[PDB]
Amino acid sequence: SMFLPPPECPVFEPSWEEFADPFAFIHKIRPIAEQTGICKVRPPPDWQPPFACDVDKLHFTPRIQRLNELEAQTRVKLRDYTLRTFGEMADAFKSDYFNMPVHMVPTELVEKEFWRLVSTIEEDVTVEYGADIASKEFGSGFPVRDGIKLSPEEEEYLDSGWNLNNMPVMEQSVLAHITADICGMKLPWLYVGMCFSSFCWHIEDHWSYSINYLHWGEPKTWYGVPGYAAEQLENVMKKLAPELFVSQPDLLHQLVTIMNPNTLMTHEVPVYRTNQCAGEFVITFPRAYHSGFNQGFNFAEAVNFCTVDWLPLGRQCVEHYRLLHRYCVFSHDEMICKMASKADVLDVVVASTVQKDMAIMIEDEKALRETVRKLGVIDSERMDFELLPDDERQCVKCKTTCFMSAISCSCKPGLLVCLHHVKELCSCPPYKYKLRYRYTLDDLYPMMNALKLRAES
Ligand SMILES: Cc1cccc2c1[C@@H](N)C(=O)N2
Ligand SMILES: [Cl-]
Ligand SMILES: [Mn+2]
Ligand SMILES: [Mn+2]
Ligand SMILES: [Zn+2]
């Protein structure tokens, strides 16, 4: 009645042995957690990263949020509070809203109340929050390196796999090997919460994993949907709020919304919940929709990552983006080829999985090139796509980031289409077209062979 909490998501308590390697651990829980989309990970009791900061010297620009269900909000873009003044505002808000000591409101009640107030148009509650990548004004909650002497305890956690700053540059996240500037994806985001500040339903760019660590404060309440129910959820969303689905003019205009999990559960979409408390991790799996809100003043840090498991999903995702005409954050094929070009220094399990994705890439590329030849495109020239800014190598039709090949035409200088959209570039006859390609098929097979040798198969 009014609000029925979804079932709880898995909670894992790894021993220090299991916890040592995050990628091994994530792989182990994967068959369980991917059925629920999110899961929680409680570190061993003696895993306490040192959090220390001056609350008066950390400052940030607050973002403002209206709280209406099904109302469109924009995904956060890449006034001023200090952490102390925000904290004071946030505690006062919650304390005044409930007329209770700010830390005495039951989590059950805030949740019930959150879903009441987002559904009631008579109640125009607005809240504020912080969201940004680390900077000089507000840095990572985890120990980093620079011109400040670290204690032996901080040095212990400097190189932890669970220090989210390390997640990008680690040798089991294929995002590490990307040389392209994708700071939005590789760098951790910092989130300063207050009561009811919320993140709308979304999945991660390129269907990556995400991992969220609650450093300090009141809990963060989560809802998660498993990857297999993604399109099921999207169907429901289109039905009740189709306005969210009109084509986005940019990646800076992605529309997302708050929507009651009971509404989803009513339409047979599986939904799980959890309250993430301070010192706990939440992990989201590929294409797992998730949303949530903060119980009160808190501080979280989150980062994207991609394991070898993800590679085939990454390819499927870029295909899905093409159908939707959605912009890519990076070129997936460019990443695969970058890794192939470094086959000798690759982890051997990585090499093996990259090899299989590369084989699919090459076979798809072979067929596409045969098709455009049959359309009468004859002229061709090698082109170093990776040197072009992304906005200079998107298919004018489906907006995909080109890398393996594209079609150009002297009639339309600087414009390109991917090989799926040869007809869409201009009205000139195809013999005026040019296939621009990064590699010949003859360059590609040896790159794939290097992977095979490194995989030792
Ligand atoms: C504010 C915001 C936006 C998008 C994702 C996330 C947040 C956070 N409050 C959080 O923890 N994840
Ligand atoms: Cl409202
Ligand atoms: Mn308190
Ligand atoms: Mn997310
Ligand atoms: Zn295209």
Residue ranges per structural domain of the chain: 1-328, 329-457
> Ligand 2 centroid vs 259 CA: distance in angstroms?
12
Is residue 335 a contact partner of residue 173, using CB atoms and an 8 Å limit? no
Is residue 451 a contact partner of residue 340, using CB atoms and an 8 Å limit? yes
Nearest CA to 409 out of 375, 386, 370, 362 is that of: 375
Cβ neighbours of residue 1 closer than 8 Å, sequence gap 6 or more: none
Tell me the C-alpha to C-alpha distance, in Å, between residue 397 and each of 352, 364, 418: 34, 19, 8
Tell me the Ramachandran region of residue 359: left when phi exceeds 0, alpha when psi lies from -120 to 50, beta otherwise.
alpha
Tell me the Ramachandran region of residue 414: left when phi exceeds 0, alpha when psi lies from -120 to 50, beta otherwise.
left
**Which atom of ligand 1 is least distant from the CA of 293?**
9
Which of these CATH numbers, 1.10.472.10, 2.60.120.650, 3.30.565.10, 2.60.40.10, describes 1-328? 2.60.120.650
Give yes or no for residue 220 CB within 6 A of ligand 1. Answer: yes
Is residue 297 a contact partner of residue 217, using CB atoms and an 8 Å limit? yes
Q: Whose CA is nearest to atom 6 of ligand 1?
A: 199
In angstroms, the CA 212 to CA 293 distance is: 13
Give yes or no for residue 131 CB within 6 A of ligand 1. Answer: yes
15 among annotated binding-site residues: no
Q: What is the per-residue burial (b if ≥16 Cβ within 10 Å, else e) of 88-112?
A: ebbbebbbebbeeebeebeeeebbe
129 among annotated binding-site residues: yes
Strands 433-437 and 379-382: parallel
Nearest CA to 174 out of 28, 43, 358 is that of: 358
Burial class (CB in 10 A: 0-12, 13-18, 19+), 82: middle
In angstroms, the CA 14 to CA 382 distance is: 50
Is residue 407 a contact partner of residue 436, using CB atoms and an 8 Å limit? yes
**Which atom of ligand 1 is least distant from the CA of 214?**
11
The CA radius of gyration of the chain, in Å to the nearest whole number, is 24
Structure tokens at 421: 């959209």
Cβ neighbours of residue 449 closer than 8 Å, sequence gap 6 or more: none
Q: Report the sign of the C-alpha dihedral through residues 22, 23, 24, 30, in that order.
A: positive
Structure tokens at 110: 């805030």
Which residue shows structure tokens 């500040």? 197
Q: Whose CA is nearest to atom 8 of ligand 1?
A: 191
> Ligand 5 centroid vs 415 CA: distance in angstroms?
12
**Which atom of ligand 1 is least distant from the CA of 76?**
3
What phi, psi does 433 have (nearest 5°)? -85, 165
What does the angle CA 337 – CA 390 – CA 401 come to, to the nearest 5 degrees? Answer: 60
Cβ neighbours of residue 367 closer than 8 Å, sequence gap 6 or more: none
Cβ neighbours of residue 363 closer than 8 Å, sequence gap 6 or more: none
- Name the structure determination technique: X-ray
Is residue 230 a contact partner of residue 38, using CB atoms and an 8 Å limit? no
What is the three-state SS of the chain? Answer: CCCCCCCECCEECCCHHHHCCHHHHHHHHHHHHCCCCEEEECCCCCCCCCCCCCCCCCEECCEEEECCCCCCEECCCCCCEEHHHHHHHHHHHHHHHHCCCCCCCCHHHHHHHHHHHHHCCCCCCEEEEEEEECCCCCCCCCCCCCCCCCCHHHHHHHCCCCCCCCCCCCCCCHHHHCCCCCHHHHCCEEEEECCCCEEEEECCHHHCEEEEEEEEECCEEEEECCHHHHHHHHHHHHHHCHHHHCCCCCHHHCEECCCCHHHHHHCCCCCEEEEECCCCEEEECCCCCEEEEECCCEEEEEEEECCHHHHHHHHHHHHHHHHHCCCCCCCHHHHHHHHHCCHHHCCHHHHHHHHHHHHHHHHHHHHHHHHHHHCCCCEEEECCHHHCCHHHCECCCCCCECCCEEEEECCCCCCCECHHHHHHCCCCCHHHEEEEECCCHHHHHHHHHHHHHHHCC
What phi, psi does 330 have (nearest 5°)? -145, 170
Burial class (CB in 10 A: 0-12, 13-18, 19+), 161: middle
β partners of residue 302: 189, 212
Cβ neighbours of residue 340 closer than 8 Å, sequence gap 6 or more: 354, 358, 447, 448, 450, 451
Nearest CA to 203 out of 90, 365, 324, 60 is that of: 324
Please report the resolution in angstroms.
2.1
Nearest CA to 361 out of 388, 335, 322, 328 is that of: 335
290 among annotated binding-site residues: yes
Nearest CA to 43 out of 124, 139, 142, 126 is that of: 142
| Side chain identity at residue 299, one-letter code | F
Q: Report the sign of the C-alpha dihedral through residues 140, 142, 146, 149, in that order.
A: positive
Nearest CA to 219 out of 141, 114, 288, 293 is that of: 293
Q: What is the per-residue burial (b if ≥16 Cβ within 10 Å, else e) of 328-342?
A: bbbbbbbbbbbbbee
| Side chain identity at residue 76, one-letter code | V
> Ligand 4 centroid vs 162 CA: distance in angstroms?
17
| Side chain identity at residue 285, one-letter code | F
Q: How many CB atoms lie within 10 A of CB 84?
A: 14
